[PDB]
Amino acid sequence: TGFDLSTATTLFWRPVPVHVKQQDREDVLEELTFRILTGVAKQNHNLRILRIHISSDSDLFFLHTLEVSEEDFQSLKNDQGILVDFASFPGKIISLLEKCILAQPGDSPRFQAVLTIRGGESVFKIVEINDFKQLPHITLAFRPG
Amino acid sequence: GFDLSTATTLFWRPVPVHVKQQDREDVLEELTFRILTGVAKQNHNLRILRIHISSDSDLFFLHTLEVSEEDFQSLKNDQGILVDFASFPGKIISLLEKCILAQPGDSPRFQAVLTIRGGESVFKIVEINDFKQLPHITLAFRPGN
């Protein structure tokens, strides 16, 4: 049962500059590999699912993952003021990732991907940094597994 | 206690605001914003930023925010603000300008919202883009002068 990696469609798969924070470590800027795929559940091809994988490349192939069923999306959508439907969601995330990829140090507003790892969870956000403040454009929670 | 008699008014003009309350339709109204910097009547070495919201139609529709230099630290931290107290008002004004200039076909589209709930209100300026609505600034206001 569950997400069928077998027939999933990958929409985006490449490195993205990320500003990482752990409690007991120095801040780091790392290119992390981001992958966004849509698919369906094996036991029911009618269940639509979105999956996002974040990872540092290593021979462990170890991932942090987020999985959002179309059902989960209803709640996620309302908690973040998201205005698009489930099908359009990945594309909106991808556009934000592209701005992070494009961003250069003098930009203003500047787009930046940020990751904070605490306990068994990572919180990923894409923020804009402007002459006034930093503010989030999207926030996503990830988990190992 | 804010000392009006020695305050500098930085901004005093109308701003289109979406006024929200739970038991009535939203109302889009030009509300008058006065932004002033000054010091406490009880202490003329305590700098204070005051923002006063009023209506030309209702002389008793009144909402006020006063932020001392020390209160600003907590505000600055909570909201990822990257400027000092002296620069704070100017950034608020830039955001208010975006709301004043906003056009129906903008994307992102800026909008001023005031949500009134009992003896408290929340003022925020949000952007509405093709993906979501997200706040640029959020500020707690009290009823009266």
Numbering used by the authors:
A (entry chain B): 14 to 158
B (entry chain A): 15 to 159
Give the text the authors published on this PDB structure.
Here, we demonstrate that the centriolar protein SAS-6 forms rod-shaped homodimers that interact through their N-terminal domains to form oligomers. Proteins of the SAS-6 family comprise an N-terminal domain with the evolutionarily conserved PISA motif, followed by a segment with a predicted coiled coil and a less-conserved C-terminal region predicted to be disordered. Furthermore and in conclusion, because these residues are well conserved among SAS-6 orthologs, we propose that the self-assembly of SAS-6 homodimers into a 9-fold symmetric ring structure is a fundamental property at the root of the universal 9-fold symmetry of centrioles.
By contrast, we were able to produce soluble recombinant proteins from C. reinhardtii Bld12p (Nakazawa et al., 2007), which has the same domain organization as other SAS-6 orthologues. Like for C. elegans SAS-6, we started by producing a fragment encompassing the N-terminal domain (denoted crN) and solved its structure to 2.1 Å resolution by X-ray crystallography. We found that the asymmetric unit of the crystal contained three equivalent crN dimers (denoted the crN-dimer hereafter). The monomers in each dimer are related by local 2-fold symmetry. The overall structure and organization of the crN-dimer, as well as the F145 residue engaged at the N-N interface and corresponding to I154 of C. elegans SAS-6, are similar to that of the C. elegans ceN-dimer. The stability of the crN-dimer in solution was assessed by ITC, and the Kd was determined to be 60 ± 20 μM, which is similar to that of the ceN-dimer from C. elegans. Overall, these results indicate that there is strong structural conservation among N-terminal domains of SAS-6 proteins across evolution. In addition, they demonstrate that the function of the critical residue within the β6-β7 loop mediating the interaction between pairs of N-terminal domains is likewise conserved. Having the structures of both the crN-dimer and the crCC-dimer of Bld12p allowed us to build a structural model of higher-order oligomers using both dimer interfaces. Strikingly, when crCC-dimers were associated such that their N-terminal domains interact as observed in the crN-dimer, we obtained a ring with a 9-fold symmetry (see Experimental Procedures for full description of the modeling).
